[PDB]
Each structure stands twice: as structure tokens, then as C-alpha cells.
Amino acid sequence: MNIVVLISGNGSNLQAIIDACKTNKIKGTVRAVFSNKADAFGLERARQAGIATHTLIASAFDSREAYDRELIHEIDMYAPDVVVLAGFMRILSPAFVSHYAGRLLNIHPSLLPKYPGLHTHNGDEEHGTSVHFVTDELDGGPVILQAKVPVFAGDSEDDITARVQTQEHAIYPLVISWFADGRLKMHENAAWLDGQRLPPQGYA
Amino acid sequence: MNIVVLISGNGSNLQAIIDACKTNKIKGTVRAVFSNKADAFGLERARQAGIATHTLIASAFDSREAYDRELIHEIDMYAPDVVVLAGFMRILSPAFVSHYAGRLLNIHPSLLDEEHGTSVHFVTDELDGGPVILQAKVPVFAGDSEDDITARVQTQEHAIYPLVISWFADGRLKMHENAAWLDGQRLPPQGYA
Ligand SMILES: Nc1nc(N)c(CCCN(C(=O)CSCC(=O)NCCCCOP(=O)(O)O)c2ccc(C(=O)N[C@@H](CCC(=O)O)C(=O)O)cc2)c(=O)[nH]1
Ligand SMILES: Nc1nc(N)c(CCCN(C(=O)CSCC(=O)NCCCCOP(=O)(O)O)c2ccc(C(=O)N[C@@H](CCC(=O)O)C(=O)O)cc2)c(=O)[nH]1
């Protein structure tokens, strides 16, 4: 099945997805990669894997709606069964969200609200990452899987972040594979795995 | 003055034009780069230059027509004053050619022993035809190889195509009735010089 990934940066998560499609762990094909930043290194990961790229920059458009109308237009050329946001830094409008309702995924490095992340100030606790269906509740549509990342004394911000990214790379291919195998659906602003409704914090 | 460049491979010509816009030698801006091959190295030259990129692959389209319809559509998002074909390996349909009439430029490595050279011309529906604007003949001697010919023709491509684009940016070059006209003067079959 066809996966279209949207990025804005480095693309380490895109790459974990491409490799999981290479080793047949996801039953799918990344057909196109989309960026809102022209220098994004994720476009070079796509080029080397021979995947078609498109970059849509906001200044080039007249209105937010205009941008999303074209973004929809270009994504649909690849007949997506999922559209995966992997570090996509733009908010998607109501028309975009409803257009891909139930097959629009996102990963945020947080669990459900408190998380010692940033490093703008090792440590205590609360740190992680969750993959969730994207809804109009910005950053807060239904969670599918989360992963708590253990903090330790001898940890730096780069230690924590790298550890979070290592968990992002494990869970996002897992979720997209359950989606590709027909086991994950959204309805009633709830995530469903094998017909069972997931609790607010995902599986398990 | 907006430049959209269309490529299929290495992109050395694209690099020569980005370079000339930087140096204000071409008073214009490359606004986007289109490719019909996903792996094309010119896409990487565009990424580093910070230029928007779009790859349209033929297998994704159902027909020639559909493809060119999407190409026009995505190019016109960048309101091109000129569309520059710089190693783009696909024949553009009559409809596309019509749509960018007098605004579509191409470079091909043959003027139109040593028979070798390169020429820039306006694209008109006579494939490879359309009026020549500027050529450069490249002599070959015994000893230099086909690759050294290529390398010499390429040095010239990088000299004449930023130059035609420079004239087009300054409103000095126009196409009318299947003839190129620089400063009013009608260019002869072999272009300027
Ligand atoms: N409607 C809707 N739209 C969404 N996009 C979302 C997505 C969630 C909100 N979102 C994010 O959480 C950030 S991306 C997640 C993340 O941190 N990934 C890191 C790991 C992957 C990268 O690493 P690697 O590249 O290596 O894989 C986010 C954060 C900030 C802005 C924002 O205001 N952004 C802009 C405004 C942008 C605009 O709308 O034009 C601003 O003003 O700053 C927008 C969205 C949603 O839930 N609903
Ligand atoms: N209607 C129309 N369409 C055009 N696109 C053009 C322009 C292109 C015409 N053309 C060429 O000039 C070929 S020589 C180009 C070249 O390498 N220049 C030097 C710079 C190199 C970059 O170097 P660097 O990347 O490093 O900058 C060309 C002719 C035929 C095929 C063809 O049959 N091509 C395909 C068919 C493709 C299709 O239509 O689907 C085939 O069967 O193989 C392909 C191209 C035109 O004049 N008329």
C-alpha cells in the first residue's frame, strides 16, 4: 500500500520508515515525500532511495487554504493509503484533516502533557514519544502507541533526545506496519487495534 | 524575473545558471527545479542552493497528456518568466510548447575531423528546431577522447546558456514568427556569433 511521508527536516524518521519498507517489515511503499523546507536533508534521503519529492514553500502561496489545496492535489497523485507526518512542522487545516481522516498519522516527542524535554534549562522522569491519529484537536487526536524513555543521572540533552529518537524509530514503523496490515483504524475519535478500542494512552 | 529549470540528470547547467543569478549576471531568480527522474543529482544541487524541487515521474501518470497537464500546473505556481530546459530528456507535448511560447529555451550538444558544438534555441514544435539564439563550435583533435569532447562541449554549454538567459532577463531577446530577435535585430540561422 502507498505511504506518502511529510517532513520539514533531517528525516531520520522517514529513513526508519523507508528501511522498514525495504526489509518488508511494513507491507508498503513510500511513494512520495513532501517538504515545506527546500534545504531539508530528508529530501536527500528520498533522492538516494529514488523516491519522488515535492517541496511546497508557504511564501509561494496566497493563503493557508491555497497551500493545503495544492498540498492535497499533489499528495493524491500518489493515491495514498496513509499520510505520515514525520517532523512536519506545519498545522494542517480542517479541510486537510477531514480529507485524510483516519489515515493521517503523526509522532510527537511527549506522552500526554508533562515531559521534562526541551533542554532549555540527567534527570527525574516523564519523557517519551507517541504516534497518534491526527485530528483537529491540534497535537491531541487519539494516541496509538507511546514509549517512555528512561532518564538516568549521567544523561545530557543529547543523551535524552537521541534516546527519544531511537524510540521514535522503533514505534513509528510498528504503527505504520499495523496500519498496513489492516489492524488499526480510527472511528469515534478513538484508535482501534484488531477491533478493540485503545485506552487514551494507546496500546497497553 | 522568474526562472523555472527542468532537468533529468547531473544538472551542471543548472549549477551554471544558479551561479550566474548569484553573481547578478542573470538578473533573475531560479524559483523551482523540475525533474522527471527521482534520483537526478541536480535535485541535490538545488537542495543545497535552497531551491524548491518537484519530481514528476512518468510511471505515476496514466498518459503523456496527464503528465504535461501536471507539469504546467506545478510550473505555473512559480509564475515563470522563462522555462529553461537544461538536460530535460522528455519530449514536451504541443500543448506545453504552446503554453510557454517564446518563453521555452533548450540547449542541445550539436550545432545546427571535428563535427561538435552546442546550441541554445527557442522551443517551437519542430523538435530540435525552433530558432537558434547562440551556438559555440567545439573543435576536436586527434587524441582527445569522446569524454574530452563532452567535457569541452560542457564548458561551452555553461558559457552560452547563462548568456542567452542573461539577454532574455534583460528583455533583449524575443521570439516572433519562428525567429529570434535580439535588440530588434533578427538573428541569422546560427544565432549570434
Ligand atoms: N492540525 C494539526 N496539524 C498538525 N500538524 C498536527 C501535528 C502536531 C503539532 N506539531 C508538532 O507536534 C511538531 S512535529 C512533531 C515532532 O516534534 N517531531 C520531532 C521528531 C521528528 C523530526 O525528526 P526527524 O526529521 O529526524 O524525523 C506542530 C508543532 C508546531 C506547529 C506550529 O505551530 N508550527 C509553526 C506554524 C506552522 C504553520 O502552521 O504554518 C510555528 O509558528 O512555529 C505545528 C504543528 C496536529 O496534531 N494537528
Ligand atoms: N517537443 C520538444 N520537447 C523537448 N523537450 C524539446 C527539447 C529537448 C530535445 N531533446 C534534446 O535536445 C536531446 S539532447 C539534450 C542534452 O543532453 N543537452 C545537453 C545538456 C545535458 C545536461 O547536462 P547537465 O545535466 O550536467 O546540465 C530531446 C529530444 C528527444 C528526446 C527523446 O526522444 N527522449 C526519449 C523520449 C522521451 C519522452 O518523450 O518520453 C527517448 O526515447 O529516449 C529527448 C530530448 C524540444 O526541442 N521539443
Please check if A168 is assigned to a binding site. yes
How far the first Cα of chain A sits from its last, in Å, is 27
Smallest CA-to-CA distance from B96 within B119, B120, B66 is with B66
Alpha-carbon Rg for chain B, nearest whole angstrom, is: 16
Parallel, antiparallel, or unpaired for β A128-133 and A104-108?
antiparallel
- Cα separation values, B128 from A102, A193, B26, B107, B120, Å: 49, 58, 25, 9, 10
B38–A51 C-beta distance less than 8 A:
yes
Q: Ligand 2 centroid vs B72 CA: distance in angstroms?
A: 18
| DSSP structural state of residue B63 | S
Structure solved using which method?
X-ray
Q: Which of A108, A127, A132, A169 is catalytic?
A: A108
| DSSP structural state of residue B126 | S
- Name the strand (E) or helix (H) holding B43: helix B41-48
How far the first Cα of chain B sits from its last, in Å, is 26
CATH of domain B1-193: 3.40.50.170
Nearest 5 degrees, angle CA B88-CA B99-CA B50?
50
- Closest Cα to atom 40, ligand 1: which residue? A90
Please check if A135 is assigned to a binding site. yes
The residues, ordered by sequence, that sit 6+ positions from B59 with a Cβ below 8 Å of its Cβ are: none
Distance CA B94, CA B105 (A): 15
Distance CA A33, CA B46 (A): 16
Question: Does B172 reach chain A within 8 Å, measured CB to CB?
Answer: no
User: Among the atoms of ligand 1, which is closest to the Cα of residue A107?
Assistant: 15
Distance CA A53, CA A72 (A): 14
Strand order in the sheet with A190-193: A184-187, A190-193, A196-197
Enumerate the domain spans of chain B.
Answer: 1-193
Which grid coordinates belong to A3? 505511504
Nearest 5 degrees, angle CA A181-CA A182-CA A188?
145
Q: For residues A60 and B52, is the Cβ–Cβ distance under 8 A? A: yes
CB atoms within 10 A of CB B92: 24
Q: For residues A86 and A66, is the Cβ–Cβ distance under 8 A? A: no
Cα B40 to the center of its chain, rounded Å: 16
The residues, ordered by sequence, that sit 6+ positions from A126 with a Cβ below 8 Å of its Cβ are: A111, A114, A115, A116
Parallel, antiparallel, or unpaired for β B104-108 and B117-122?
antiparallel
User: What residues are paired with A131 via a beta bridge?
Assistant: A107, A145
Parallel, antiparallel, or unpaired for β A190-193 and A104-108?
unpaired
Distance CA A131, CA A177 (A): 13
Q: For residues B62 and B68, is the Cβ–Cβ distance under 8 A? A: no
Q: Nearest 5°: phi and psi at B79?
A: 35, 65
Please check if B157 is assigned to a binding site. yes
Q: For residues A142 and A198, is the Cβ–Cβ distance under 8 A? A: yes
In the chain, the amino acid numbered B193 is A
Cα A123 to the center of its chain, rounded Å: 27
- Indicate the burial class of A92 (C-beta count within 10 angstroms; 0-12, 13-18, 19 or more): buried
A11 lines ligand 1 (CB under 6 A): yes
- Closest Cα to atom 9, ligand 2: which residue? B128
Distance CA B159, CA A160 (A): 52
B127 lines ligand 2 (CB under 6 A): yes
B52–A57 C-beta distance less than 8 A:
yes
- Closest Cα to atom 11, ligand 2: which residue? B108
Q: For residues A45 and A11, is the Cβ–Cβ distance under 8 A? A: yes
Please check if B11 is assigned to a binding site. yes
Distance CA B34, CA B42 (A): 10
CB atoms within 10 A of CB B182: 17
A108 lines ligand 1 (CB under 6 A): yes
A43–B47 C-beta distance less than 8 A:
yes
User: What residues are paired with B186 via a beta bridge?
Assistant: B181
B39–A50 C-beta distance less than 8 A:
yes
* Secondary structure of residue B162 in the 3-state scheme: helix
Question: Does A93 reach chain B within 8 Å, measured CB to CB?
Answer: no
User: What residues are paired with B5 via a beta bridge?
Assistant: B33, B84
- Cα separation values, A29 from A1, A22, B176, Å: 6, 9, 48
Alpha-carbon Rg for chain A, nearest whole angstrom, is: 17
User: What residues are paired with B134 via a beta bridge?
Assistant: B120, B192
Q: For residues B21 and B169, is the Cβ–Cβ distance under 8 A? A: no
DSSP result, chain A? -EEEEEESS--HHHHHHHHHHHTTSSSSEEEEEEES-TT-HHHHHHHHTT-EEEE--GGGSSSHHHHHHHHHHHHGGG--SEEEESS--SPPPHHHHHHTTTSEEEEES-SSS----S-----SS--EEEEEE--SSTT-S-EEEEEE----SS--HHHHHHHHHHHHHHHHHHHHHHHHTT-EEEETTEEEETTEEPPTT---
Smallest CA-to-CA distance from A29 within A41, A39, A20 is with A20
- What b/e readout covers B119-143, taking b as 16+ CB neighbours within 10 angstroms? bbbbbbeeeeebbbbbbbebebeee
Distance CA A181, CA B43 (A): 34
Distance CA B111, CA B119 (A): 6
B60–A51 C-beta distance less than 8 A:
no
A139 lines ligand 1 (CB under 6 A): yes
Residue carrying C-alpha cell 483516519: A102
Domain A1-204, classified CATH 3.40.190.10, yes or no: no
Q: Which ligand is nearest to the CA of A43?
A: 1
- What b/e readout covers B57-74, taking b as 16+ CB neighbours within 10 angstroms? beebbeeeeebbebbbeb
User: Among the atoms of ligand 1, which is closest to the Cα of residue A106?
Assistant: 7
- What b/e readout covers A23-42, taking b as 16+ CB neighbours within 10 angstroms? eeebebebbbbbbbbbebbb
